[PDB]
Coordinates of C-alpha atoms in Angstrom, one line a residue:
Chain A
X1 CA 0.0 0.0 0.0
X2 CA 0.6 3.8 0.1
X3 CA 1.6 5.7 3.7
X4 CA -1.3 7.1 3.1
X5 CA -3.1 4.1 4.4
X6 CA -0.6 3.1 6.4
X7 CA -1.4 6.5 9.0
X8 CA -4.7 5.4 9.6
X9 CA -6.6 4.8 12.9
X10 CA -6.4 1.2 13.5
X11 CA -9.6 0.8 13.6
X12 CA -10.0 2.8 10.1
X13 CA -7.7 1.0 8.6
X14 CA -9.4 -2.1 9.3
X15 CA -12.6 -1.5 7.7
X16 CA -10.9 -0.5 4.5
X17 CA -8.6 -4.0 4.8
X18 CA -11.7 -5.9 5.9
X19 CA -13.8 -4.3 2.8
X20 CA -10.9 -5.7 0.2
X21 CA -10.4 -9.1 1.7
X22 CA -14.0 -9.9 1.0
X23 CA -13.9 -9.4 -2.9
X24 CA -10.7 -11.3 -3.1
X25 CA -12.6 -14.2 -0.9
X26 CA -14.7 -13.9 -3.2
X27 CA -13.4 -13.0 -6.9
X28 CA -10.0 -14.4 -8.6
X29 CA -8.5 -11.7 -9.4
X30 CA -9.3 -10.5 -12.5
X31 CA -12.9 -11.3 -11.2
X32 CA -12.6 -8.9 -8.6
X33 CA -13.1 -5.2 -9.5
X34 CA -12.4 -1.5 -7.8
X35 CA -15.7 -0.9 -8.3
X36 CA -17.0 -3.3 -6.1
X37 CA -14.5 -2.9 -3.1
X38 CA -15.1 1.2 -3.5
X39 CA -18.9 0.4 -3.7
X40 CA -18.7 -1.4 -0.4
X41 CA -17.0 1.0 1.5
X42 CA -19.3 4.3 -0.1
X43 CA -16.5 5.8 -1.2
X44 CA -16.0 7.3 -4.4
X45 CA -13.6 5.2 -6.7
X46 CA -10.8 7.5 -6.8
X47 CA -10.6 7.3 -3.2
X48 CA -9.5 3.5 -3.3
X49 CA -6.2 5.6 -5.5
X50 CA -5.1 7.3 -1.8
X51 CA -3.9 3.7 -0.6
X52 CA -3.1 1.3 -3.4
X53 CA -1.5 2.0 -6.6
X54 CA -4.0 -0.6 -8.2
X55 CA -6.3 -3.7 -7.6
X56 CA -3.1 -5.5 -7.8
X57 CA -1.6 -3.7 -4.7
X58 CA -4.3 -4.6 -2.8
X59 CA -4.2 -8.0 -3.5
X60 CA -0.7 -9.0 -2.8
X61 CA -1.1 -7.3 0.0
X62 CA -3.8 -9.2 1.5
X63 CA -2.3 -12.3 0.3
X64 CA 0.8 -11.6 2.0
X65 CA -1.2 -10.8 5.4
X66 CA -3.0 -13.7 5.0
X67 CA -1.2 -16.8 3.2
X68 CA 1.9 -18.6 3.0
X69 CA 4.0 -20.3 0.7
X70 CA 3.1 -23.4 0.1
X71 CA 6.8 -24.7 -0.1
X72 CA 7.9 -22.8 2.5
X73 CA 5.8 -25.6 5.2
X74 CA 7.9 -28.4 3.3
X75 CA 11.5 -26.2 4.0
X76 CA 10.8 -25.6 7.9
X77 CA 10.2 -29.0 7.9
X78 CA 13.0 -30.2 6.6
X79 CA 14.7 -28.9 9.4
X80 CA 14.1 -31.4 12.3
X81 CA 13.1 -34.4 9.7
X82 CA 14.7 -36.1 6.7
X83 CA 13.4 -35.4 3.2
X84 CA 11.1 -38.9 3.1
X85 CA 9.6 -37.8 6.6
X86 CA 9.0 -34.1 5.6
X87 CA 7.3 -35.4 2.6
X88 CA 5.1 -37.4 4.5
X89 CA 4.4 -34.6 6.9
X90 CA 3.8 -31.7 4.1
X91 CA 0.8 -33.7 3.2
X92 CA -1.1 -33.1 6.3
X93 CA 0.7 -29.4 6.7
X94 CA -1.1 -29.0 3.0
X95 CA -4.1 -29.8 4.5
X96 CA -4.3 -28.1 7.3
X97 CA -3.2 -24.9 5.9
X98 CA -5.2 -24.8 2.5
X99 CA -8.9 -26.5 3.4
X100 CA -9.6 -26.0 6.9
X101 CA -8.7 -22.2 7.7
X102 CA -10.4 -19.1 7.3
X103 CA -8.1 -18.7 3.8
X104 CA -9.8 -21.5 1.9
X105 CA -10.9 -18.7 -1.0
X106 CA -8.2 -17.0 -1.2
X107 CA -6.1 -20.1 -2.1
X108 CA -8.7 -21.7 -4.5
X109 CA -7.9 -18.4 -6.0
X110 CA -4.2 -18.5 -5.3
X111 CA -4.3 -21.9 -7.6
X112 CA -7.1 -21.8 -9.8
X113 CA -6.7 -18.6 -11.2
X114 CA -3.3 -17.3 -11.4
X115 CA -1.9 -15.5 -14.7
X116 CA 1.6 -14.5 -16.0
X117 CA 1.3 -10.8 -14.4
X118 CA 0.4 -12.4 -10.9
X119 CA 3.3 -14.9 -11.3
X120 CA 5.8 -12.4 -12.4
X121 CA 5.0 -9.5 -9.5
X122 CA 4.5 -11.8 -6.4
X123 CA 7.6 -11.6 -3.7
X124 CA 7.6 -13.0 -0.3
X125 CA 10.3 -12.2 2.5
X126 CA 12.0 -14.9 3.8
X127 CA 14.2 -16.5 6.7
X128 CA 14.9 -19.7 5.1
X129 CA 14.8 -20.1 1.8
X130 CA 16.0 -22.8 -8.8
X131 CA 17.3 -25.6 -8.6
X132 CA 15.6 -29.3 -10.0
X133 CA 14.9 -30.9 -6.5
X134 CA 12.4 -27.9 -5.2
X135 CA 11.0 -27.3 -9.3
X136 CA 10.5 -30.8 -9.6
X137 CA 8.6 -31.1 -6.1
X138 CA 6.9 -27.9 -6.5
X139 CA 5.1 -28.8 -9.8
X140 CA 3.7 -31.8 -8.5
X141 CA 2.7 -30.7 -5.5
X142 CA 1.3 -27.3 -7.0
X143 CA -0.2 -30.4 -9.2
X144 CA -1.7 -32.0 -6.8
X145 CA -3.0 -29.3 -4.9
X146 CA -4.7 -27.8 -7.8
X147 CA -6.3 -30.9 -8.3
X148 CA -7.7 -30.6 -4.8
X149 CA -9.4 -27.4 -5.4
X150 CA -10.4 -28.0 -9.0
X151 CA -11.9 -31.2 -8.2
X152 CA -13.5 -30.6 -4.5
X153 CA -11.0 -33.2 -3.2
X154 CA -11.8 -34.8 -0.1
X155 CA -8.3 -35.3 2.4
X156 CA -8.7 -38.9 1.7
X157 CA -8.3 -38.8 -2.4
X158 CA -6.0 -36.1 -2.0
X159 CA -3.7 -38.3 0.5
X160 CA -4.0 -40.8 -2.0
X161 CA -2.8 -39.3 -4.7
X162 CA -0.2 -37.4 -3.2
X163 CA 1.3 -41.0 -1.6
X164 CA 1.3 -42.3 -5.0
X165 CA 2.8 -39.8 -7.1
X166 CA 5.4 -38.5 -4.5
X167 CA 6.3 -42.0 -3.9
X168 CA 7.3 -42.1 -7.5
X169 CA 9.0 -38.8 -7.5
X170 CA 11.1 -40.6 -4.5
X171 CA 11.6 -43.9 -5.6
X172 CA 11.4 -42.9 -8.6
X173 CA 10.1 -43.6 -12.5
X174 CA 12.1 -46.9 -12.9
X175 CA 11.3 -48.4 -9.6
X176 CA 7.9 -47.6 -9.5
X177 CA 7.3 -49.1 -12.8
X178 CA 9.7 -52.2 -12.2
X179 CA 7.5 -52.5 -9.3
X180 CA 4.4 -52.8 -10.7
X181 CA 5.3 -56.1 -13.4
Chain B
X1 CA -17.9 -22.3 -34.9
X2 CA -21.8 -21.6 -35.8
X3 CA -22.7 -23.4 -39.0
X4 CA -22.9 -19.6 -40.7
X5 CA -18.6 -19.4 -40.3
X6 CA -18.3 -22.5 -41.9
X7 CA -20.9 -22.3 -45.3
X8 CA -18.9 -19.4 -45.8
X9 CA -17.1 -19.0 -49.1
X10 CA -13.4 -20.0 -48.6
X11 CA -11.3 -16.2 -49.5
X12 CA -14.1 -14.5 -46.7
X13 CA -14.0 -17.7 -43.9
X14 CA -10.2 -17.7 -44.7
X15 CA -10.1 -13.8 -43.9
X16 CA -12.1 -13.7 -40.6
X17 CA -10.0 -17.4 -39.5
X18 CA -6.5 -15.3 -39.9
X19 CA -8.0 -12.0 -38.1
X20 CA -8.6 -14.0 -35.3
X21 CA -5.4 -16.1 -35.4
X22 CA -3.7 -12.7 -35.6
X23 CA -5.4 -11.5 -32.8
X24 CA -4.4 -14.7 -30.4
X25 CA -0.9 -14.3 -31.7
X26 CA -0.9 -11.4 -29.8
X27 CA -2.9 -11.3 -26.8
X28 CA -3.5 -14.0 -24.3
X29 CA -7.3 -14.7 -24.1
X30 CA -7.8 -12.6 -21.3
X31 CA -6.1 -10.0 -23.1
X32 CA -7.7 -10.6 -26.7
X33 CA -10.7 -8.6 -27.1
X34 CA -13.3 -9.5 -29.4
X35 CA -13.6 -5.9 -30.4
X36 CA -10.0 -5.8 -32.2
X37 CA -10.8 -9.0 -34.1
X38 CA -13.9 -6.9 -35.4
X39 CA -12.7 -3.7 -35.7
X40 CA -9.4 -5.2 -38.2
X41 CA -12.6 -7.2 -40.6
X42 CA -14.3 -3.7 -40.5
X43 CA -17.7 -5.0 -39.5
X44 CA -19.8 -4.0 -36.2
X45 CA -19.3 -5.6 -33.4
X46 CA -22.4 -8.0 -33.7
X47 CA -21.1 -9.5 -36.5
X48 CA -18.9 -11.9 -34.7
X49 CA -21.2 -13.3 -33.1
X50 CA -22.7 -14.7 -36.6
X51 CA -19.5 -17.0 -37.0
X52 CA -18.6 -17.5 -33.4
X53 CA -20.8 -17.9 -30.0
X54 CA -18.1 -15.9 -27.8
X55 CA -14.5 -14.9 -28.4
X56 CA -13.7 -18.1 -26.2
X57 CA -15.5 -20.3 -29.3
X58 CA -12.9 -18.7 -31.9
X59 CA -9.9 -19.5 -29.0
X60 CA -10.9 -23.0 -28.7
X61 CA -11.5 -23.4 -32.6
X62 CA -7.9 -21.2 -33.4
X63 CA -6.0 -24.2 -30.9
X64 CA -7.3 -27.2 -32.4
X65 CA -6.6 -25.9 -35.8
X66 CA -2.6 -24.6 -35.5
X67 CA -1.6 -26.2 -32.0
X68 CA -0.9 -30.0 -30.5
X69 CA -1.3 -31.7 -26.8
X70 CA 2.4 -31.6 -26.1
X71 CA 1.9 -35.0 -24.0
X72 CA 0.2 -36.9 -26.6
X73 CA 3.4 -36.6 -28.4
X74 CA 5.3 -38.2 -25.5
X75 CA 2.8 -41.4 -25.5
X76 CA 3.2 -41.5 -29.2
X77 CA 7.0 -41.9 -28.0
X78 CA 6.1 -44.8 -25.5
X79 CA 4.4 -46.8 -28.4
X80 CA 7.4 -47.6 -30.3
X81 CA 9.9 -46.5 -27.7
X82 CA 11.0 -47.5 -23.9
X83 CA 10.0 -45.3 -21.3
X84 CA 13.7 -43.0 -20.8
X85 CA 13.6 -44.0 -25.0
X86 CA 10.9 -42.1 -25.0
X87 CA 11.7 -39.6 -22.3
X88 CA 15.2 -38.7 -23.9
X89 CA 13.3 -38.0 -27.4
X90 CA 10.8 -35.8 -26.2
X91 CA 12.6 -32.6 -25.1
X92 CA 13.5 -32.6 -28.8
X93 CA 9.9 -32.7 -30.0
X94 CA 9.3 -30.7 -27.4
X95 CA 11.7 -28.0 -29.3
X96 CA 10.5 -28.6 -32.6
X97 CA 6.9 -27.9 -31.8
X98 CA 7.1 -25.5 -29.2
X99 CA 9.8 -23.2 -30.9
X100 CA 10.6 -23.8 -34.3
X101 CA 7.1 -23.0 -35.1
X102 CA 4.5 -20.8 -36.6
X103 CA 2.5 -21.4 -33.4
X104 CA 5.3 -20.2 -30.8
X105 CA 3.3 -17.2 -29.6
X106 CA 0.0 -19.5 -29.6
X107 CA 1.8 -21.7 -26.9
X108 CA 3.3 -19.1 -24.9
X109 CA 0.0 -17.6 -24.3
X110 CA -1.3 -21.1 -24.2
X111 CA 1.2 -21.8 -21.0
X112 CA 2.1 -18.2 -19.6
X113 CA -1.8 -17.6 -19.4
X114 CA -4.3 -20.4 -19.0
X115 CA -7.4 -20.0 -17.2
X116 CA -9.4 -22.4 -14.6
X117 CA -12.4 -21.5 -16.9
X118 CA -10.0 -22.4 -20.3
X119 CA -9.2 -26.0 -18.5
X120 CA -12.0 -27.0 -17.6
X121 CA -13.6 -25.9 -21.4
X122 CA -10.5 -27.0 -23.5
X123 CA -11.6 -30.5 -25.4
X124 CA -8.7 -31.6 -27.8
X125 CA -8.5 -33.9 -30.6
X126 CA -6.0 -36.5 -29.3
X127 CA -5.7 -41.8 -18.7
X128 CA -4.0 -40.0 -15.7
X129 CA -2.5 -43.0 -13.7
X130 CA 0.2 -41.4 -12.0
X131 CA 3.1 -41.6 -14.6
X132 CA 1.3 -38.8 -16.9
X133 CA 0.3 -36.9 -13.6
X134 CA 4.2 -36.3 -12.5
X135 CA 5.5 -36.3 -15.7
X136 CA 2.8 -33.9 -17.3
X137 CA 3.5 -31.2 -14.6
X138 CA 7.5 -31.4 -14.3
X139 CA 7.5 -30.9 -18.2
X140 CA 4.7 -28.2 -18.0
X141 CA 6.6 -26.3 -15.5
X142 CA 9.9 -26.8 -17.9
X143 CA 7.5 -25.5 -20.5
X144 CA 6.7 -22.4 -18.9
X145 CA 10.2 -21.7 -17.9
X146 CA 11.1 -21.9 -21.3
X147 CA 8.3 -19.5 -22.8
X148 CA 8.3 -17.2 -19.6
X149 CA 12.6 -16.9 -19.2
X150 CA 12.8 -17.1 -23.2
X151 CA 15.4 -20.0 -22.4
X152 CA 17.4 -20.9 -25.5
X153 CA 17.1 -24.6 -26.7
X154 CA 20.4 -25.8 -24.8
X155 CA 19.2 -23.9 -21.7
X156 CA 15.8 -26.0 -21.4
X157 CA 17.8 -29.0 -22.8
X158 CA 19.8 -29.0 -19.6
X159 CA 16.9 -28.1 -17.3
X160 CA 14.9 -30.5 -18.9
X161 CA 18.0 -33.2 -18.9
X162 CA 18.7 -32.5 -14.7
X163 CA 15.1 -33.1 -14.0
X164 CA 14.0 -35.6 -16.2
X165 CA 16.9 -37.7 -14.7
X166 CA 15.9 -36.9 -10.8
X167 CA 12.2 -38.3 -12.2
X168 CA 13.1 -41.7 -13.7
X169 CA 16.3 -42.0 -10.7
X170 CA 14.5 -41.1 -8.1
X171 CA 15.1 -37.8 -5.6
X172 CA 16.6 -40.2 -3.1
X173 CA 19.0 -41.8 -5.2
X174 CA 19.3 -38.6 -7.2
X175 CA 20.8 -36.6 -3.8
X176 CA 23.1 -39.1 -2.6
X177 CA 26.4 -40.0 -4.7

């Protein structure tokens, strides 16, 4: 945001914050409008201009205040467990994190409808933190978890697939099919 | 398409066809507006919708005309070729469709920007055990390095090469040598 919102009474402040994370619970974001969030509040459009620079301001902004990085759960675990127990820890982390809270929407949003523009402008700061072991577990786990929301998974067919597949990611391609004859 | 698109004579179908291809060259669908398309033909804005039931219809018709399910090239692999056979081959077909190609900017819109509402629409002229699963989305990811980094053909080669090989290896016996 702007330090224009920023000096606001923190109860002002929260009404305006409140007003946006509504529409972006319930709008991807090129669903969501200024309209709608400006509308809400009674306040004339241009007014939204004094504390975001755009929609898109707003919406990082929330999602930083309100989600975390999905791979971020599997590196802090990877602290106190090896790699094959963190895997089989992430799952439930997953779960926990991305169905039952009060963020739900936003990351059916976060994973359903996300665009070059989001991709290339989101940042997150970071205490621990390209190479092919994280791209390679990242894209099936983003997989995965896409197919969770795209497909109203329930934990038990989302446990399921994610045994199997990161199984074979471990084990790997060979194994799992010399396994199989 | 609507019937009236395609009992239309070949130079005029063959016009409006390239006026929208042009358009989706250029703009991802989001971007794309059905106004442009019209505006270049020079007819009102109404007139679209004769040959097309929204812009998403002309998308949808434009990719299955010029563009190809990268995977079903891979299991066209498997059929006459073992699995790393097949694996090995691929980033090469991968190249050769994906770059060298009239279509280019028609796949880097189609990775860069899909849609959940493009996904779940998008039916192809071509199961998910979960081989394809794993594989499809470490190669999509490459993919969209490739279009979104502009990665040169050795660049995604090596990528490509690195991860392929942790895949069929396995990360554990991949990390430890």
């Amino acid at each position: 945001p702007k330090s224009t919102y920023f000096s606001l009474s923190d109860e002002k402040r929260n009404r305006v914050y409140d007003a946006c994370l509504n529409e972006f619970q319930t709008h991807s974001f090129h669903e969501a409008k200024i309209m709608h969030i400006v509308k809400a509040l009674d306040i004339p459009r241009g007014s939204f201009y004094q504390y975001f620079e755009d929609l898109k301001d707003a919406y990082f902004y929330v999602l930083s205040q309100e989600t975390l990085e999905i791979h971020d759960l599997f590196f802090n675990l990877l602290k106190d467990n090896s790699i094959e127990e963190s895997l089989d820890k992430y799952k439930y982390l997953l779960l926990e994190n991305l169905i039952d809270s009060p963020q739900y929407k936003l990351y059916k949003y976060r994973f359903l409808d996300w665009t070059y523009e989001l991709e290339r402008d989101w940042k997150p700061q970071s205490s621990a933190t390209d190479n092919p072991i994280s791209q390679v577990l990242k894209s099936v786990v983003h997989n995965l978890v896409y197919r969770l929301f795209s497909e109203n998974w329930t934990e038990k067919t989302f446990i399921e697939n994610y045994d199997k597949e990161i199984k074979l990611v471990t084990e790997g391609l060979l194994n799992y099919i010399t396994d199989r004859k």
